[PDB]
Paper text:
Among the most frequent pathogenic mutations are [name] and R555W, both associated with granular corneal dystrophy ([name]) characterized by the early-onset formation of amorphous aggregates. A striking feature found in both the [name] and R555W structures and involving their mutated residues is a crystal packing interface between the FAS1-1 and FAS1-4 domains of different [name] molecules, where residue 124 interacts with residue 555 in a second [name] molecule (i.e., His124 and Arg555 in [name], Arg124 and Trp555 in R555W). In the [name] structure, the FAS1-1 His124 is in direct contact with Arg555 through a side-chain hydrogen bond. His124 also engages in a second water-bridged interaction with the main chain of Met517. The side chain of Tyr121 also forms a hydrogen bond with the main chain of Leu559 in the second [name] molecule. In addition, multiple hydrophobic interactions involving side chains of Tyr121, Leu120, Met517, Phe547, Leu550, and Leu559 surround His124 and Arg555. A comparison of all available structures reveals that the [name] mutation has no influence on the structure for the FAS1-1 domain, whereas in both the [name] and the R555W structures, the α-helix harboring residue 555 is shifted relative to the position of the helix in the wildtype structure. Instead, the position of the α-helix is likely to be determined by the intermolecular contact with the FAS1-1 domain. The Arg124 and Arg555 residues in wildtype [name] do not permit this intermolecular interface due to size and electrostatic repulsion between the two arginines.
Author numbering: 47 to 65, 70 to 634
């Protein structure tokens, strides 16, 4: 028989439930009264006695809706109907609700009490008894004023709403019906979302965008939406070149308008905590609240909440919500996790690829790659960057093994797709794609090191592996580590060969075919860059037995023996540098 109130400290807003920690970021205190209609006797057992039912007019005073009671009484015609025959509900505004009306609208009501005040009170009423049992999301009650509909919603969290007024105290039975207490005075709903946009002067840039895009027919139509409508002042915070480029292009335009529209009508006093919501374009937004401010992604950019329409709810927003798919590469990458990278592109002359409509894919590494320093701008940097800019617009989820990607600097880089990572040359994808209108940003964990020759060119140009190229020659393996292939050479240095045991180097020297078998064991038949090693991967060697290739604590190991220098790229493989020679 017991109930509870939770109240935010330093406020007036209270939520009247049965018997959540914070709400809109503000701490709560919970206070126990018991449910409207029952009394405390002298002590006894904890709300014993129920009060008698009174009829709907007197029930108004019992719930605390004395202004609604006073206004009803001063019409001389609704009060006798309220205390006589029938079955009724009234969604009765609180005392604070009438006082929160604008002076100009409340004067209009109380100066004509037999028409406009009576019409207002009749619109809050339904000619049948309707409990919150009968209230489910999306349904329309018929009011007693001129058959006008009342919009009610019922959100997951338990908040009932009635024309986007929160229902405060529910289900107070009358002898001829029920009384509900709501916190707004509500009014008739006569316009669709399209029709409001064509009336308000604050939306003339919005109405033209809708007109250019052909979304008028949708916004005239049925079903429920939320419009995060941008004012003219929102469109003026966007620089002219950026905005005209979006609005000019039909795809970018419809992506923009759909990023301002939700699939269900939700309204502001239903928002009590963080709720991720998708727009029609596909982007998730973070809708919260801080005080009585609505917040979008933690920004109090909503200046006018709960503007009502027959096909949904409009909230006015102050900043345009431009999605990734309407942005250029520069707009989607400059104030982000690849900020250091994009500054290097523009300083090295390559900025005009990123700033317009060129269909590109960008491989920009993370900012933690450049924590220890940044390379200087020269010929060699701006040629290397020019090879991180790939022709055509790509999606990484659609890349395939042994795909080749042309750069703007003439190279062809190889896509290697492994089970837990995707790699282009040595570099691997570190975060999700950012798909813009014209180009897409791939987010990388290394600066990439493109191949500059063959496996034999790596080894003959480096003096650590001169005993290895001699063994490769003496096993007849030069001509095949130099033609086209996909190898993984675990290449032992000179000090590895001079480390060899007597019985193993005697098997190396005394038969050229046994030397061929030991060197073919060192060579994988796939390309396995370090970014494609999981916990452990088995790798078929050209001898035929498998190699055990792990990555623990950022060191590649092969059969539990360490790689000193991973990922030296080559036009027909990858070279990893090992410090000793593998056995059998």
């Amino acid at each position: 028989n017991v109930c509870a109130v939770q109240k935010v400290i330093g406020t007036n807003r209270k939520y009247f439930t049965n018997c959540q920690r914070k709400i809109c970021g503000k701490s709560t205190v919970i206070s126990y009264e018991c449910c409207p209609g029952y009394e405390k006797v002298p002590g006894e057992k904890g709300c014993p006695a129920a009060l008698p039912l009174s009829n709907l007019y007197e029930t108004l005073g019992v719930v605390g809706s004395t202004t609604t009671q006073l206004y009803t009484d001063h019409t001389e015609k609704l009060r006798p109907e309220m205390e006589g025959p029938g079955s009724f509900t009234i969604f009765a505004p609180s005392n604070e609700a009438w006082a929160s009306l604008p002076a100009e609208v409340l004067d209009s009501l109380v100066s004509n009490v037999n028409i406009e005040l009576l019409n207002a009170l009749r619109y809050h009423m339904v000619g049948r008894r309707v409990l919150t049992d009968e209230l489910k999301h999306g349904m329309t009650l018929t009011s007693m004023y001129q058959n006008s509909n009342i919009q009610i919603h019922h959100y997951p969290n338990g908040i009932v709403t009635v024309n986007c007024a929160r229902l405060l105290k529910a289900d107070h039975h009358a002898t001829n019906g029920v009384v509900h207490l709501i916190d707004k005075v509500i009014s008739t709903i006569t316009n669709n979302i399209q029709q409001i946009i064509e009336i308000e002067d604050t939306f003339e840039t919005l109405r033209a965008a809708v007109a250019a895009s052909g979304l008028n027919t949708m916004l005239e139509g049925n079903g429920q939406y939320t419009l995060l409508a941008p004012t003219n002042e929102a469109f003026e915070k966007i620089p002219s070149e950026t905005l005209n480029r979006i609005l000019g292009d039909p795809e970018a335009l419809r992506d923009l308008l759909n990023n301002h529209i939700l699939k269900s009508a939700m309204c502001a006093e239903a928002i009590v905590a963080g709720l991720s919501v998708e727009t029609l374009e596909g982007t998730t937004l973070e809708v919260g609240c801080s005080g009585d401010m609505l917040t979008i992604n933690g920004k109090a950019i909503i200046s006018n909440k709960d503007i009502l329409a027959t096909n949904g709810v409009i909230h006015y927003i102050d900043e345009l919500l431009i999605p990734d798919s309407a942005k250029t590469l520069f707009e989607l990458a400059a104030e982000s996790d690849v900020s250091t990278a994009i500054d290097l592109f523009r300083q090295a002359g390559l900025g005009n690829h990123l700033s317009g409509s060129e269909r590109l894919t960008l491989l920009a590494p993370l900012n933690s790659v450049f924590k220890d320093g940044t390379p200087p701008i020269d010929a060699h940097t701006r040629n290397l960057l020019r090879n991180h800019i790939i022709k055509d617009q790509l999606a990484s989820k659609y890349l395939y093994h042994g795909q080749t990607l042309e750069t703007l600097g003439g190279k062809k880089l190889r896509v290697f797709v492994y089970r837990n990572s995707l790699c282009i040359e040595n570099s691997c994808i570190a975060a999700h794609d950012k798909r813009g209108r014209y180009g897409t940003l791939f987010t990388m964990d290394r600066v990439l090191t493109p191949p500059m020759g063959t496996v034999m060119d790596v080894l003959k140009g480096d003096n650590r592996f001169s005993m290895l190229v001699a063994a490769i020659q003496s096993a007849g393996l030069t001509e095949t580590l130099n033609r086209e292939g996909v190898y993984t050479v675990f290449a032992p240095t000179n000090e590895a060969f001079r480390a060899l045991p007597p019985r193993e180097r005697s098997r190396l020297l005394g038969d050229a075919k046994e030397l061929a078998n030991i060197l073919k064991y060192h060579i994988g038949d796939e390309i396995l860059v370090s970014g494609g090693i999981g916990a452990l991967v088995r790798l078929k060697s050209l001898q035929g037995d498998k190699l055990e290739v792990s990555l623990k604590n950022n060191v590649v190991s092969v059969n539990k023996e360490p790689v000193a220098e991973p990922d030296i790229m080559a036009t027909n493989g990858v070279v990893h540098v090992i410090t000793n020679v593998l056995h059998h």
